[PDB]
Design a protein around this ligand. Structure first.
Ligand code: 9B0
Ligand code: ZN
Ligand code: ZN
Ligand code: ZN
Lengths: 66, 200, 289, 160, 85, 182
RNA sequence: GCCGGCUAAGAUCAAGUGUAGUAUCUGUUCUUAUCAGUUUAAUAUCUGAUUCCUCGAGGA
């Protein structure tokens, strides 16, 4: 429960999906050749891709329900 | 008729200063010794002369036959400090299920570990009632003992006559009987006052 | 020297015991052909009780000397005697017998111990099969990497024990699965381990604490030996079940899988489509250079 | 029932995969069924072979008819005198033609069938015109060599 | 009340007593000790300086994780000292 | 304010994975979608039962343990070790998604024994010895169910026939694996 | 288990015995009934309401 990203019987789809999006972005920031792949694919500098991922970290999957 | 399935072993020759405990240690080194179901005292016999004199022969029955064949190939022709023993399948010439199953359960492989039995009763008496009545405390102790005897075997029972809350301790042999006594004593009335019970 | 030496093994001083055991070990290692095998058998059966010593040096020397004596006189007779002793004794002596069987199987290759041990599981009587299962558990835990050649031989026995109604059978089979999984890792034994997971998994709905503890241990061993992708594949359909019991069990298993190897799970998550309100597709992984 | 062929006259050497292996050359036999007895726990000589198409079952019934399999008259079919141990390859018209040589038959004969398969039970009942044909069947046909099956003709009811 | 401490572990080495000398602190195994145990600073202070991590008696030798616990990275949690409340 | 089974079956791409209780979930659309992932074995099926996962029927009474063939064929030297590692075979194994449950334990060529019991002689060198089912095939014609089957005498020559092989199916690359030990 | 059923398919409430732990046994009862609320994946559970026939009695 103290670890961030764990769930329980009341976990919703939104929390699950934002958790996997957030650690996906962190894994992209960590691994050197995944960021290379993305920066070649979208034709940007690697610093720009890193900053874009950090900016996307705040609200991935949009704002929550109700 | 029973050719094999003989769990009795015959120890030919022994030191004439043999005690029963050294012998049952010698025999327990090779497995579990069957115990007489009605009683204690493992089924071990020291054959004796017309007097206290020790003939030097011994009988021992085992729970299983594999322990007999163990004693056959490990005790035969082996020396205790002074003498040379001889081991042979015993010769004979001329309640039940309960304890049988218990001795069997002595070979279990059940899970161990786990957590690894005293009930405290309060608000039962007062020190002010025992100042002008020397026989009320003994009658209250006898009533508490008669109440604790119905739930299980009470091993120790004490009553604090100098405690202002009326503390009493009942220590039984099993924690289930103490839990049953704490469940049957909680909320009950004793002497016009509501007494409480807790575990220890 | 040796028949004069064997009564000193029962002395109760620690230095005397350690030095006597070391001396008997050296003698058995180099001068094994000078004393009969019957006396060696008696000495090993006496050493059996020293595996319970409160001191670590006594246990270390006893393990060494037992290995030497077993290497000397041969595995067959000592293994027969150890199985007989495992059948008839109290708990601590049976545990020491299990340790001794594992030692014999490590010094003399487990090929020499496994057939006789599996032949004892054929006895139609409980408390004998459970002893065989405990011995197999400790054997695999003790031999570790050497077990990669013997997983195919014990798989049907573990199947049988996992289909059994007895609870100790399934708990001990789960312990065996865990030790076997952590023993072979990086050696390409995933087929048998997936096969055995197919029999371990139905026990997740068990209320008995010891059984569920052993099942969790086996699952965390298979997480290492088999990989987190398979575990996530086993958890996906239960993560959002309508019943709260299924959800509790599956989220416990999932949290255990998530705390270890959080990074690998990035490559294993299934695709989840966008709804009207929220975006769920990870688009970067769809790029194609 | 149309795609399945009922086989009768199987000995102890024939088994459940053996009939499917023998019927594999005739057609694609998908399954084989052998009903086990309650007292003996073995096959009663009659079984079924369910194929894929009805033409394969017709070819198996027209090819494996009155064959000598395991020393037994195996035959495939579409799934007061008493005759016992009769071959399942014969029909009611064949039994009426075989019984016409001894005496005259009053009507068409009937053969008993099993309640599960319905091909052949093992016994049959036939009625003659007079007692002379029954005596000729009990003298000559009671013990005659049939198609790899020793039949036995007896009287169904007799008054002392 | 057998609960691990689970605080940030420091530079202090865990100790075992004469009774627990060969044991693993987490799973209680005796086979293949692999990784040296580290404890936090509140477990290593003053009278607590040298003490068994399993029971709390006078330490005599180093505490170790087993190879099985090291493979599963169970040496990466906090202080493994058994603390009672 | 909850779907019905038929209503939810109309929304999902795969309706045959929908079940009775699936409409009672907190998020049935995600549940049904995960039930359709191209993997992910389902739940052990006895969660809703009331018999503690061990069925007390089906006659579980049976032999204790059948050792493998390699088990049967000092105690044995390195030569019998050689035997145990030459005879060692891989047993039957189930693939990734085949969970166990209480019930799933019970549910032109002729053999020499059947040919010896049927009274058929062995194949000669150069002669015609057909089975008694081959005369009907020679009279009526070839079977339409297996047109590629060959029989000696009709389609196959007499000198073919060898041992117990009385028929052969004649149906009308670089298959070597790449990296393998020599 | 035997040839759909013979009430060994489940829950529960009191007491006894006993273990480190799991447990084991006896009396029971089992709503034969309806509605509303709680709750359960659904049951379950709990929380409340609800003259006639026969031979002085019994049943509904
Ligand atoms: C179910 C088993 C029981 O829990 C049992 C181990 C234990 O619980 C009982 C209590 C007691 C006191 O009777 C016994 C305890 C422990 C033992 C007998 C172990 O020995 C010791 O304590 C002495 C010391 O810790 C080291 C012993 C040692 C090196 O043999 C240890 O095993 C090993 O380290 N191994 C075994 C594996 N072996 C191979 C060889 C290749 C490379 C190294 C790893 C794999 C290397 C050496 C365990 C032995 C006894 C189980
Ligand atoms: Zn460990
Ligand atoms: Zn300690
Ligand atoms: Zn700490």
């Amino acid at each position: 429960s103290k670890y961030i990203g764990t769930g329980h019987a009341d976990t919703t789809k939104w929390e699950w999906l934002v958790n996997q999006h957030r650690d996906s972005y962190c894994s992209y920031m960590g691994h050197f050749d995944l960021l290379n792949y993305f920066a070649i694919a979208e034709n940007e500098s690697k610093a720009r891709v890193r900053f874009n991922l950090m900016e996307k970290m705040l609200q991935p999957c949009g704002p929550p329900a109700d | 008729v029973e050719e094999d399935r003989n769990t009795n072993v015959y120890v030919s020759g022994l030191p004439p200063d043999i005690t029963v405990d050294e012998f049952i240690q010698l025999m327990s080194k090779f497995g579990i010794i069957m115990r007489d179901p009605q009683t204690e005292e493992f089924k071990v016999k020291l054959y004796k002369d017309n007097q206290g004199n020790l003939k030097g022969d011994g009988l021992c029955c085992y729970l299983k036959r594999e322990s007999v064949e163990l004693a056959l190939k490990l005790l035969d022709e082996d020396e205790i400090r002074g003498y040379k023993l001889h081991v042979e399948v015993a010769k004979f010439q001329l309640d039940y299920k309960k304890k049988l199953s218990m001795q069997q359960k002595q070979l279990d492989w059940r899970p161990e570990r786990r957590a690894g039995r005293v009930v405290i009763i309060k608000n039962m008496f007062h020190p002010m009632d025992f100042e002008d009545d020397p026989l009320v405390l003994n009658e209250i102790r006898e009533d508490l003992r008669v109440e604790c005897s119905k739930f299980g075997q009470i091993r120790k029972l004490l009553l604090f006559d100098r405690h202002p809350d009326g503390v009493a301790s009942v220590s039984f042999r099993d924690p289930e009987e103490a839990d049953y006594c704490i469940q049957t004593l909680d909320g009950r009335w004793f002497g016009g006052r509501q007494i409480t019970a807790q575990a220890w | 020297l040796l028949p004069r030496l064997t009564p000193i093994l029962k002395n109760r001083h620690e230095k005397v015991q350690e030095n006597c055991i070391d001396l008997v070990g050296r003698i058995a290692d180099r001068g094994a052909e000078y004393v009969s095998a019957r006396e060696w058998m008696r000495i090993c059966f006496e050493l059996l009780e020293l595996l319970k010593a409160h001191k670590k040096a006594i246990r270390r020397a006893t393990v060494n000397t037992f290995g030497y004596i077993a290497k000397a006189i041969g595995p067959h007779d000592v293994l027969a005697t150890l199985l007989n002793n495992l059948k008839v004794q109290e708990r601590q002596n049976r545990v020491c017998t299990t340790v001794a069987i594992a030692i014999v199987a490590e010094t003399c290759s487990p090929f020499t111990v496994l057939p006789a041990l599996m032949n004892e599981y054929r006895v139609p009587e409980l408390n004998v099969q459970n002893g065989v299962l405990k011995s197999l558990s400790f054997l695999f835990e003790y031999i570790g990497e050497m077990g990669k050649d013997y997983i195919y031989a014990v798989t049907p026995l573990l199947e049988d024990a996992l289909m059994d109604r007895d609870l100790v059978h399934r708990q001990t089979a789960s312990a065996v699965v865990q030790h076997m999984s952590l023993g072979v890792y990086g050696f390409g034994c995933e087929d048998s381990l997936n096969h055995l997971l197919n029999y371990v998994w139905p026990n997740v709905f068990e209320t008995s604490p010891h059984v569920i503890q052993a099942v969790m241990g086996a699952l965390e061993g298979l997480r290492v030996a088999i990989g987190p992708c398979r575990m996530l594949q086993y958890c996906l359909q239960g993560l959002f079940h309508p019943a709260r019991k299924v959800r509790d069990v599956y989220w416990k298993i999932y949290n255990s899988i998530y705390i270890g190897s959080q990074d690998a799970l990035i490559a294993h998550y299934p695709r989840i489509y966008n709804d009207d309100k929220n975006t769920y597709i990870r688009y970067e992984l769809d790029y194609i250079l | 029932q149309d795609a399945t062929v009922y086989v009768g006259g199987l000995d102890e050497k024939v088994s459940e995969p053996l009939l499917w292996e023998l019927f594999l050359q005739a057609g694609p036999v998908v399954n084989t069924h052998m009903p086990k007895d309650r007292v003996t726990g073995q096959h009663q000589g009659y079984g079924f072979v369910e194929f894929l198409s009805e033409e394969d079952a017709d070819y198996a019934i027209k090819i494996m008819n009155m064959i000598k399999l395991y020393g037994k008259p195996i035959r495939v079919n579409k799934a007061n005198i008493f005759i016992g141990n009769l071959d399942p390859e014969i029909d009611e018209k064949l039994l009426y033609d075989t019984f016409s040589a001894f005496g005259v038959i009053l009507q068409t004969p009937k053969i008993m069938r099993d309640p599960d398969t319905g091909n052949s039970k093992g016994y049959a009942f036939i009625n003659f015109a007079s007692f002379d044909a029954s005596d000729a069947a009990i003298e000559a046909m009671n013990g005659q060599y049939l198609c790899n099956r020793p039949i036995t003709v007896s009287y169904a009811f007799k008054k002392d | 009340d057998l609960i691990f401490c689970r605080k940030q572990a420091g530079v202090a080495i865990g100790r075992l007593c004469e009774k627990c000398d060969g044991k693993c602190v987490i799973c209680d195994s005796y086979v293949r000790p692999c990784t040296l145990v580290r404890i936090c600073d509140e477990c290593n202070y003053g009278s607590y300086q040298g003490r068994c991590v399993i029971c709390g008696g006078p330490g005599v030798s180093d505490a170790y994780y087993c190879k099985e616990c090291t493979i599963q990275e169970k040496d990466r949690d906090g202080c493994p000292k058994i603390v009672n409340l | 304010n909850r779907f019905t089974v038929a209503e939810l079956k109309q929304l999902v791409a795969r309706p045959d994975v929908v079940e009775m209780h699936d409409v009672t979930a907190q998020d049935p659309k995600l549940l049904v979608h995960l039930k359709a992932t191209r993997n992910s074995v389902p739940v052990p099926r006895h969660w809703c039962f009331k018999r503690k996962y061990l069925q007390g029927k089906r006659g579980i009474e049976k032999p204790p343990f059948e050792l493998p063939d390699f088990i049967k064929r000092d105690i044995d030297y390195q030569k019998l070790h050689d035997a145990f590692f030459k005879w060692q075979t891989k047993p039957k194994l189930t693939i990734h998604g085949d969970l166990y449950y209480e019930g799933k334990e019970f549910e032109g060529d002729l053999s020499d024994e059947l040919r010896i019991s049927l009274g058929m002689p062995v194949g000669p060198n150069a002669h015609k010895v057909p089975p008694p089912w081959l005369i009907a095939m020679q009279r009526y014609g070839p079977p339409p169910s297996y047109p590629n089957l060959k029989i000696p005498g009709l389609n196959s020559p007499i000198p073919p026939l060898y041992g117990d092989v009385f028929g052969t199916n004649a149906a009308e690359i670089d298959r070597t694996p790449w990296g393998e030990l020599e």
